[PDB]
Amino acid sequence: AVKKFKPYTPSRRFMTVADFSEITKTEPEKSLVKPLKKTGGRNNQGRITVRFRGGGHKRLYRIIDFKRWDKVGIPAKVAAIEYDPNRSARIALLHYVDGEKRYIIAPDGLQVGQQVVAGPDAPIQVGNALPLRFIPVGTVVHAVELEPKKGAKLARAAGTSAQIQGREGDYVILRLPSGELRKVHGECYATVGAVGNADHKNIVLGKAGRSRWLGRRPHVRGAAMNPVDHPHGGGEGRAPRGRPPASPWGWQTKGLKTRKRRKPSSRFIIARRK
Amino acid sequence: MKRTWQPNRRKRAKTHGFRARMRTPGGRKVLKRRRQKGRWRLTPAVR
RNA sequence: GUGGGAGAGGGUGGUGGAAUUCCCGGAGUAGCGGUGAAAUGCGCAGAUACCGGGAGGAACGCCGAUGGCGAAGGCAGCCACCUGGUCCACCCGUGACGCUGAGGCGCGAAAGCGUGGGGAGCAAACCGGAUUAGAUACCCGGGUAGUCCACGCCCUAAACG
RNA sequence: CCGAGGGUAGGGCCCGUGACUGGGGCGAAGUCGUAACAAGGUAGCUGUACCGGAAGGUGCGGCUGGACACC
RNA sequence: CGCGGGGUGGAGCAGCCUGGUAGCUCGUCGGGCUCAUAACCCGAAGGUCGUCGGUUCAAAUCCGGCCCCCGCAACCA
RNA sequence: CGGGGGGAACCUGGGGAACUGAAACAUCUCAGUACCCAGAGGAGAGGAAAGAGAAAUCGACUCCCUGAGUAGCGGCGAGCG
RNA sequence: GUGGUUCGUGGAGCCAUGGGGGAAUCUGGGCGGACCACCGCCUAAGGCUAAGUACUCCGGGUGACCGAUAGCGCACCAGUA
RNA sequence: CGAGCUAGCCCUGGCCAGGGUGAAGCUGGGGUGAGACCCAGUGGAGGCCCGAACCGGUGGGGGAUGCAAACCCCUCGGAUG
RNA sequence: CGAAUGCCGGCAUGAGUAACGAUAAAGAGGGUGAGAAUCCCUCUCGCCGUAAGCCCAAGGGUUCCUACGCAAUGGUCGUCAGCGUAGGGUUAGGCGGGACCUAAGGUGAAGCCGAAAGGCGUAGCCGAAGGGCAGCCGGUUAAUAUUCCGGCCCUUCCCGCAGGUGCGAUGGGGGGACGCUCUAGGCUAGGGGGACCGGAGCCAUGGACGAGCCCGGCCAGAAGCGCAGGGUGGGAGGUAGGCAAAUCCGCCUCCCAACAAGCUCUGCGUGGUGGGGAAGCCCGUACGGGUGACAACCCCCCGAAGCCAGGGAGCCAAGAAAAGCCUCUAAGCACAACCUGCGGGAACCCGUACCGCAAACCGACACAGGUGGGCGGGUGCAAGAGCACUCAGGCGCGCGGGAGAACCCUCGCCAAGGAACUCUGCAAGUUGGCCCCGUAACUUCGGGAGAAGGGGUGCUCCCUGGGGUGAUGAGCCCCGGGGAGCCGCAGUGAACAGGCUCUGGCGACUGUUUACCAAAAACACAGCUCUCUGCGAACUCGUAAGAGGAGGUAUAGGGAGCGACGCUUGCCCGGUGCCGGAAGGUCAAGGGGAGGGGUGCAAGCCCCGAACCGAAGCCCCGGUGAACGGCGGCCGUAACUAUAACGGUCCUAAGGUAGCGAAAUUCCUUGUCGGGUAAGUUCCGACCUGCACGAAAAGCGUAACGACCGGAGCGCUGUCUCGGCGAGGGACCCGGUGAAAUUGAACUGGCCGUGAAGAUGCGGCCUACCCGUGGCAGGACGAAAAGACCCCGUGGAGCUUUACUGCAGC
RNA sequence: UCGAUGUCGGCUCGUCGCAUCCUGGGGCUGAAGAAGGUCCCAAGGGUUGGGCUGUUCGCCCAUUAAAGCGGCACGCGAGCU
Ligand SMILES: [Mg+2]
Ligand SMILES: [Mg+2]
Ligand SMILES: [Mg+2]
Ligand SMILES: [Mg+2]
Ligand SMILES: [Mg+2]
Ligand SMILES: [Mg+2]
Ligand SMILES: [Mg+2]
Ligand SMILES: [Mg+2]
Ligand SMILES: [Mg+2]
Ligand SMILES: [Mg+2]
Ligand SMILES: [Mg+2]
Ligand SMILES: [Mg+2]
Ligand SMILES: [Mg+2]
Ligand SMILES: [Mg+2]
Ligand SMILES: [Mg+2]
Ligand SMILES: [Mg+2]
Ligand SMILES: [Mg+2]
Ligand SMILES: [Mg+2]
Ligand SMILES: [Mg+2]
Ligand SMILES: [Mg+2]
Ligand SMILES: [Mg+2]
Ligand SMILES: [Mg+2]
Ligand SMILES: [Mg+2]
Ligand SMILES: [Mg+2]
Ligand SMILES: [Mg+2]
Ligand SMILES: [Mg+2]
Ligand SMILES: [Mg+2]
Ligand SMILES: [Mg+2]
Ligand SMILES: [Mg+2]
Ligand SMILES: [Mg+2]
Ligand SMILES: [Mg+2]
Ligand SMILES: [Mg+2]
Ligand SMILES: [Mg+2]
Ligand SMILES: [Mg+2]
Ligand SMILES: [Mg+2]
Ligand SMILES: [Mg+2]
Ligand SMILES: [Mg+2]
Ligand SMILES: [Mg+2]
Ligand SMILES: [Mg+2]
Ligand SMILES: [Mg+2]
Ligand SMILES: [Mg+2]
Ligand SMILES: [Mg+2]
Ligand SMILES: [Mg+2]
Ligand SMILES: [Mg+2]
Ligand SMILES: [Mg+2]
Ligand SMILES: [Mg+2]
Ligand SMILES: [Mg+2]
Ligand SMILES: [Mg+2]
Ligand SMILES: [Mg+2]
Ligand SMILES: [Mg+2]
Ligand SMILES: [Mg+2]
Ligand SMILES: [Mg+2]
Ligand SMILES: [Mg+2]
Ligand SMILES: [Mg+2]
Ligand SMILES: [Mg+2]
Ligand SMILES: [Mg+2]
Ligand SMILES: [Mg+2]
Ligand SMILES: [Mg+2]
Ligand SMILES: [Mg+2]
Ligand SMILES: [Mg+2]
Ligand SMILES: [Mg+2]
Ligand SMILES: [Mg+2]
Ligand SMILES: [Mg+2]
Ligand SMILES: [Mg+2]
Ligand SMILES: [Mg+2]
Ligand SMILES: [Mg+2]
Ligand SMILES: [Mg+2]
Ligand SMILES: [Mg+2]
Ligand SMILES: [Mg+2]
Ligand SMILES: [Mg+2]
Ligand SMILES: [Mg+2]
Ligand SMILES: [Mg+2]
Ligand SMILES: [Mg+2]
Ligand SMILES: [Mg+2]
Ligand SMILES: [Mg+2]
Ligand SMILES: [Mg+2]
Ligand SMILES: [Mg+2]
Ligand SMILES: [Mg+2]
Ligand SMILES: [Mg+2]
Ligand SMILES: [Mg+2]
Ligand SMILES: [Mg+2]
Ligand SMILES: [Mg+2]
Ligand SMILES: [Mg+2]
Ligand SMILES: [Mg+2]
Ligand SMILES: [Mg+2]
Ligand SMILES: [Mg+2]
Ligand SMILES: [Mg+2]
Ligand SMILES: [Mg+2]
Ligand SMILES: [Mg+2]
Ligand SMILES: [Mg+2]
Ligand SMILES: [Mg+2]
Ligand SMILES: [Mg+2]
Ligand SMILES: [Mg+2]
Ligand SMILES: [Mg+2]
Ligand SMILES: [Mg+2]
Ligand SMILES: [Mg+2]
Ligand SMILES: [Mg+2]
Ligand SMILES: [Mg+2]
Ligand SMILES: [Mg+2]
Ligand SMILES: [Mg+2]
Ligand SMILES: [Mg+2]
Ligand SMILES: [Mg+2]
Ligand SMILES: [Mg+2]
Ligand SMILES: [Mg+2]
Ligand SMILES: [Mg+2]
Ligand SMILES: [Mg+2]
Ligand SMILES: [Mg+2]
Ligand SMILES: [Mg+2]
Ligand SMILES: [Mg+2]
Ligand SMILES: [Mg+2]
Ligand SMILES: [Mg+2]
Ligand SMILES: [Mg+2]
Ligand SMILES: [Mg+2]
Ligand SMILES: [Mg+2]
Ligand SMILES: [Mg+2]
Ligand SMILES: [Mg+2]
Ligand SMILES: [Mg+2]
Ligand SMILES: [Mg+2]
Ligand SMILES: [Mg+2]
Ligand SMILES: [Mg+2]
Ligand SMILES: [Mg+2]
Ligand SMILES: [Mg+2]
Ligand SMILES: [Mg+2]
Ligand SMILES: [Mg+2]
Ligand SMILES: [Mg+2]
Ligand SMILES: [Mg+2]
Ligand SMILES: [Mg+2]
Ligand SMILES: [Mg+2]
Ligand SMILES: [Mg+2]
Ligand SMILES: [Mg+2]
Ligand SMILES: [Mg+2]
Ligand SMILES: [Mg+2]
Ligand SMILES: [Mg+2]
Ligand SMILES: [Mg+2]
Ligand SMILES: [Mg+2]
Ligand SMILES: [Mg+2]
Ligand SMILES: [Mg+2]
Ligand SMILES: [Mg+2]
Ligand SMILES: [Mg+2]
Ligand SMILES: [Mg+2]
Ligand SMILES: [Mg+2]
Ligand SMILES: [Mg+2]
Ligand SMILES: [Mg+2]
Ligand SMILES: [Mg+2]
Ligand SMILES: [Mg+2]
Ligand SMILES: [Mg+2]
Ligand SMILES: [Mg+2]
Ligand SMILES: [Mg+2]
Ligand SMILES: [Mg+2]
Ligand SMILES: [Mg+2]
Ligand SMILES: [Mg+2]
Ligand SMILES: [Mg+2]
Ligand SMILES: [Mg+2]
Ligand SMILES: [Mg+2]
Ligand SMILES: [Mg+2]
Ligand SMILES: [Mg+2]
Ligand SMILES: [Mg+2]
Ligand SMILES: [Mg+2]
Ligand SMILES: [Mg+2]
Ligand SMILES: [Mg+2]
Ligand SMILES: [Mg+2]
């Protein structure tokens, strides 16, 4: 839980660093399982399609396993819990008895040294993975497939988790970390436990620069801009928003629901966070 | 103070070069015009 | 010491049923609520009353006492674990090892505070209805903190026998 | 050398004093309401929180120094 | 100087727009309930409508002048 | 066996402006212009009537003259034709 | 739904076609300016086709065309410095 | 036709004299029922301090047909981010 | 052609005027020559020395070297040159690139998309200042040299012979292979000292023949060894993974090592050997050649940021790829092939001169500007790349000579006074390094702090402590301690080196910005809140394909406000926006065909067309304030007066709460009172009558921070009373070179009038010989810019919206 | 005067008018003296330093013989700010 510093600088006071004692490995990662990556914020047109992005530490991309099922039945021992810079969570190194090594996103309370399996067979125990249909109702669960054999989409982020409310036909009813209630297909693998590194939400960046290390560049408000630039700008000596609050592209930003209406996905949802 | 001409022999060739022009219909036209005018150099000479 | 006892004593983890609220489904119609009487509110966009389903939070009816336990504050569905105090019996050990206690340390209802969660019912503040001379009240309809949980503070009380 | 003392500098404490400001005491017959004393006309008091011209109200918990009809 | 709304029983408001009649709350006065006062009940009274012209048959009402009232504007310099 | 690329202008096809004019400006004009693209050649396009359009008439296409600034079209404006 | 024509939605036919529907083979089908009848014209949904036409890098001939501030930007080692 | 200037991002390299301050941690002693803690040492943190290179451009003077189409002198900001 | 600030060209005026481009600086002797301040040589003097010296990369493109030249180019001169003419000059298997690798990106069989041109895209290919790879020290030329020569090493191909082995790749596996800060041990680079080794010579001017003075005391070097390091377990069994196959790698188990013990690689050292090798003196050099010599060739110390190197720790932001290389097997081959060693042979292309912090590059210039990497010695000052002087090396900045006015610039100093200067201490000055003493409010406990204020500071002799390296010894080097003394105005003796305090505003803070008039209180910022987004996410770019988002998944991502932290952020949902609403109303195409029309003999063809069913939207119903926003008026009242806790009445969706308030907001206004001052429109503290504060366009505070803006004191001053003198660079004079804007023409005076209303030019009068030089700016409505303000134009453009009308989007 | 007549204040340098602030000279006085009042003559000379504000102006402090008012493109930016 959250290293803190004395204020021997300003901004050292409220700054706060993650507790790494969970980390059993450091300075790997298994060199067999990871390439590199790049971006800039820019798309293939050389064009910024997401603003305020770049700088930030060089990163190696640890390749991780979002299908647990291709390996049904082969257990594995957990060799390490290390540091993934490309996500909120920590990755678990697991050696299979296959002699195969894979990375997994590491559940809260997964001990280095224990055994994990995936398949309809599996014990309901932290780290294991099953078709949703075979997890008992009420089980809190993470890394969920949205569609069968397509990979883990839902609840991957530090401290997230999901819950099985019940079952209907080929579908089980899930509460997502949004709180929305969703029907997910029975056949969808999911791995029991919550995601952990839960204390993630409590770090305090604490100085400007630390926000840069994460490759987030400064964010300038419409509010201080000229009219060419933004629906909020000009005339100054400040100003209220002078109109219903808008994005730079002009659509409204307090209240407007942007989810498409006619999505087939709609007949599989029952609730609200969006 | 630093000025607008900072020659670099490679930048010149990949920019205004002969295969640069040839690569794009705008540029093929550049040559076309340049050639039709009777230009001695169709494209900057870079050592 | 030995052997035995009663008990909401404290901590952790689970777990059960009643009820309230909301959501879905069925059925069904012209009211329902609420009061001293009303009004605000809710209701033909199908309410209330009825059955079926699901979600969730809080509190534990009878037993219950005019009872029990703890130093106090305090402690009440059920189960397990860890753990305190205390009474009895037998006369077995030590041999004055006692009492009290300025300071110190620790505990300490409710409210309140900090960072997370959770939020059904309740409900300061707030709004509306009514009463009144007026009502920044009492009654009624709404209702956010809070109430609950983890950690951390605060250290008050008709903390009373 | 030490040395009364003078000088320059920076602190401590104590008295007096100050536009204004806070509440307090006192003052034969001022204005506003009725909080308490009798179930005081909402039992009261209470720690704490919020609110309100004012006494006070309400929440939560607490104390009694409060309780012959009747369902 | 400018534009806009205004001035009505003691107070505060309607009525004027669209001519004919002046209305609502409080206050005031008379009576009542009460030991008494207020509350409350029953009754009354009070106004020429800023002022001076003008229009009409008739003017708070429509038009003009002056007096005041509130508001707005007074920029480039 | 053929294609590719180049050619002053000219030609056909795919796309296609604005200034301007309307004494402001939207329809309208400029204008199917400028320009970009593809193709063709020494030409290119067109071409042998499911045509004209009132005469029981003319007969493929293209180019000039005329018909004619006529029929018309038109914020029935400017103007187009 | 549009484009073309003089046709700007107009009585708007004709020619073309992006969408929907969707025939017949001579007694069949298209047109003559919405539509109807009559009377005429013509035979769509395959293709080719000289010449009369356009142009001028190039060669020639000619000039009430210039004569070095003209005439091409260049009479000259100019699309150069 | 331009990102050989200037702006941002991407890939891959390089640069930052010297001094100063002394965070966590560790160790040891004290402390206690076990703690929190305390002190000493070690340690070497930081959009920390002073200040060159480098990067700036605060104030003033000079320049003003300039050395210069933004320069010069003095001073001044940052200087492991 | 006379006018167009016309066009092209020529030539004037300013005018022998301003300048002649860093204030590092010159003097003489000799030489050459038609000609010399300016070329060559010597001597003296000055300037650079973390450079203004040397090397590399860009870029430049013969500028290089030499002979002959001086018309132009050179800011003067030129006999010189980077200039003209000519001739010469650049040498590589090992240095850099390429017959290697891959990075971003580019390109692109497959594929996808797009009217056309074209856009995309896996693999592949291309792409380097990154990975990989074999050369070090001398000598030589006028001019190239890791290139040629000398010497000692080395690499890859081809072929052969010997030995060895299941050989074999583009396929599997390993490796390559990685951050930032701190950093150990050993070395090397470099450097200082030496009484020791080698060396021409020197005794000056009072002294010194000296353990004097001055110069030098190295460099490369295979094998072997030695020291310091890097890397690295061995064997068996099992095996289902590493898209086939493995004997390899992964995983489980068993067995010995824990250690560099071996094996292995690299650094230094030493190494057969090769080579350098000063002062000074003679000569002769754009330059360097003999001797010194047969040179010496050694000890000590200092010591990297470099090396061993994938070293070590710590920390969080979590730190390229591919080949080379090794291994493993597959076909295929086992005659082959590969492996190790030796040997012969073969080893291509392009760069190579010269400039390179600049007179050769970018700036029209031989421009005080800009330009990436490496070396960058000595001493002294705490250290240091700082500063002063100085080595090697390089330079005196391509107009000079005089004079010693005003004035200007840059600099020095001043009686008494000390901010009186002024918008303002602007500017200058004070302060200044190190050591020691000491140090307040306040505080988020870190700070505030270099707070403030002080004391010390040199040289000499005496005694003494610990460290490093040697040995636990001297010597060398480092850090000190105590005592007695000497000198001056003064010891950080020159140079580099904070003035301080009180107190308000605003922004928490470090940061960022208007290149080139604003660095700020603006932007950013951690952090808070709202909102959207279930993932083929929302959102963005694109016609599309595709991409970003993100190889992310609600502890995430997008949008928007607010802007550390503290304490807080009230009321109004009427309008607007959004959100919810399965009824209702209306609503387009379409469906429907009541009825009506055209025409036909007619069958028919054809054209209308009411009911009714029929989306979104709008209306309607609610909700919603860290959504756009909004948060009253009049009148009365208390036993002095005043004032109004209280009441009355109109309107509202609701009437501004807490805080704060003459404010970055207050008009009246220099409000009133207090404070500070002899005096205070500012400043601070109050009051509240807030024209016209007020709670995330956030309210009130807040330690710390600030080249922000305001107020006050101390200190100190030429800021001032109030000026004076002095220095240098201009200005002036002489010789050389010689511009510019401007310019209707000029023979160009004052006053009072006049005049288109401000006259050298008209009237009257006055004054006035001709022509310059140095000076000052009153005038020529002086120069410059076809006024930016203002208006006009049915002129433009950027911006906004409940202007109009479209369009994209939904 | 818009093909440019730079705008407040300050500083510097002045010069002029007199409707005189002082000094000289006078008349009247409700002028005893001294000291004032008020008007007349008179432009020779003189007319302070400082606090506040950008200020002109004004208020204020300390003095003075006095602490004058105007003009000169609200004199003066090819003179400075
Ligand atoms: Mg591109
Ligand atoms: Mg921002
Ligand atoms: Mg702006
Ligand atoms: Mg833009
Ligand atoms: Mg906009
Ligand atoms: Mg705005
Ligand atoms: Mg503005
Ligand atoms: Mg504003
Ligand atoms: Mg240029
Ligand atoms: Mg290049
Ligand atoms: Mg040629
Ligand atoms: Mg018990
Ligand atoms: Mg006993
Ligand atoms: Mg005994
Ligand atoms: Mg408590
Ligand atoms: Mg509580
Ligand atoms: Mg009551
Ligand atoms: Mg009470
Ligand atoms: Mg009472
Ligand atoms: Mg009561
Ligand atoms: Mg209440
Ligand atoms: Mg009465
Ligand atoms: Mg304006
Ligand atoms: Mg066409
Ligand atoms: Mg027009
Ligand atoms: Mg026009
Ligand atoms: Mg117009
Ligand atoms: Mg047209
Ligand atoms: Mg033809
Ligand atoms: Mg036309
Ligand atoms: Mg048409
Ligand atoms: Mg029309
Ligand atoms: Mg038509
Ligand atoms: Mg027929
Ligand atoms: Mg037919
Ligand atoms: Mg047809
Ligand atoms: Mg026809
Ligand atoms: Mg017809
Ligand atoms: Mg026909
Ligand atoms: Mg010809
Ligand atoms: Mg000519
Ligand atoms: Mg001639
Ligand atoms: Mg010509
Ligand atoms: Mg760039
Ligand atoms: Mg350092
Ligand atoms: Mg340091
Ligand atoms: Mg440090
Ligand atoms: Mg720093
Ligand atoms: Mg730079
Ligand atoms: Mg400057
Ligand atoms: Mg700069
Ligand atoms: Mg000047
Ligand atoms: Mg900084
Ligand atoms: Mg600094
Ligand atoms: Mg530094
Ligand atoms: Mg960085
Ligand atoms: Mg003329
Ligand atoms: Mg001119
Ligand atoms: Mg001349
Ligand atoms: Mg002259
Ligand atoms: Mg001169
Ligand atoms: Mg010079
Ligand atoms: Mg001679
Ligand atoms: Mg040096
Ligand atoms: Mg030369
Ligand atoms: Mg010459
Ligand atoms: Mg010359
Ligand atoms: Mg080859
Ligand atoms: Mg390649
Ligand atoms: Mg492409
Ligand atoms: Mg390379
Ligand atoms: Mg090489
Ligand atoms: Mg050499
Ligand atoms: Mg040394
Ligand atoms: Mg002698
Ligand atoms: Mg050696
Ligand atoms: Mg295997
Ligand atoms: Mg296999
Ligand atoms: Mg050696
Ligand atoms: Mg390491
Ligand atoms: Mg090691
Ligand atoms: Mg093998
Ligand atoms: Mg085989
Ligand atoms: Mg060479
Ligand atoms: Mg330089
Ligand atoms: Mg350099
Ligand atoms: Mg040079
Ligand atoms: Mg050059
Ligand atoms: Mg220039
Ligand atoms: Mg020069
Ligand atoms: Mg230069
Ligand atoms: Mg140059
Ligand atoms: Mg530089
Ligand atoms: Mg020093
Ligand atoms: Mg160095
Ligand atoms: Mg220096
Ligand atoms: Mg001179
Ligand atoms: Mg002088
Ligand atoms: Mg003085
Ligand atoms: Mg003094
Ligand atoms: Mg002032
Ligand atoms: Mg200063
Ligand atoms: Mg103090
Ligand atoms: Mg000091
Ligand atoms: Mg001394
Ligand atoms: Mg001395
Ligand atoms: Mg040593
Ligand atoms: Mg100094
Ligand atoms: Mg300093
Ligand atoms: Mg202020
Ligand atoms: Mg700031
Ligand atoms: Mg900014
Ligand atoms: Mg600008
Ligand atoms: Mg600027
Ligand atoms: Mg700044
Ligand atoms: Mg600036
Ligand atoms: Mg789109
Ligand atoms: Mg991705
Ligand atoms: Mg803001
Ligand atoms: Mg703020
Ligand atoms: Mg609010
Ligand atoms: Mg309120
Ligand atoms: Mg509202
Ligand atoms: Mg509403
Ligand atoms: Mg609303
Ligand atoms: Mg409906
Ligand atoms: Mg009929
Ligand atoms: Mg609808
Ligand atoms: Mg509503
Ligand atoms: Mg009174
Ligand atoms: Mg005030
Ligand atoms: Mg004031
Ligand atoms: Mg205000
Ligand atoms: Mg004021
Ligand atoms: Mg104040
Ligand atoms: Mg405000
Ligand atoms: Mg607000
Ligand atoms: Mg404030
Ligand atoms: Mg503050
Ligand atoms: Mg700063
Ligand atoms: Mg600042
Ligand atoms: Mg002076
Ligand atoms: Mg004359
Ligand atoms: Mg005159
Ligand atoms: Mg005359
Ligand atoms: Mg003048
Ligand atoms: Mg003038
Ligand atoms: Mg004009
Ligand atoms: Mg108009
Ligand atoms: Mg216009
Ligand atoms: Mg003008
Ligand atoms: Mg002028
Ligand atoms: Mg007079
Ligand atoms: Mg007298
Ligand atoms: Mg006078
Ligand atoms: Mg004034
Ligand atoms: Mg005065
Ligand atoms: Mg003036
Ligand atoms: Mg000026
Ligand atoms: Mg002025
Ligand atoms: Mg002037």
Author numbering:
A (entry chain 11): 2 to 275
B (entry chain P8): 1 to 47
What does the paper say about this structure?
We determined six X-ray structures of the 70S ribosome programmed by 30-nucleotide-long mRNAs with AUG codon and E. coli tRNAfMet in the P-site and the A-site occupied by tRNALysSUU bound to its cognate codon AAA or AAG, or near-cognate stop codon UAA and isoleucine codon AUA. To discriminate against pyrimidine-ending codons AAC and AAU encoding asparagine, the E. coli tRNALysUUU contains one of the most complex modifications 5-methylaminomethyl-2-thiouridine (S, mnm5s2U) at the wobble anticodon position 34.
Thus, we determined structures of complexes 3 and 4 where the SUU anticodon of tRNALysSUU formed a U·U mismatch either with the first or the second codon position. As was anticipated, the nucleotides, critical for decoding A1493 and A1492/G530 of 16S rRNA47, stabilized the U·U mismatch at the first and the second codon–anticodon positions via A-minor groove interactions. A hypothetical U·U pair possible through a shift in the keto-enol equilibrium would require a typical distance of 3.0–3.1 Å between uracils for hydrogen bonds to occur. However, positions of uracils in both models make this scenario unlikely. To put it simply, the restraints on the sugar-phosphate backbones of the codon–anticodon helix imposed by the decoding centre are strong enough to prevent the uracils to come close enough to interact strongly via hydrogen bonds. In complex 3 with the stop codon UAA and the first U·U mismatch, the codon–anticodon duplex was additionally weakened at the 3′-end where the S34·A(+6) pair was slightly deformed. These results demonstrated why tRNALysSUU normally does not read the ochre codon.
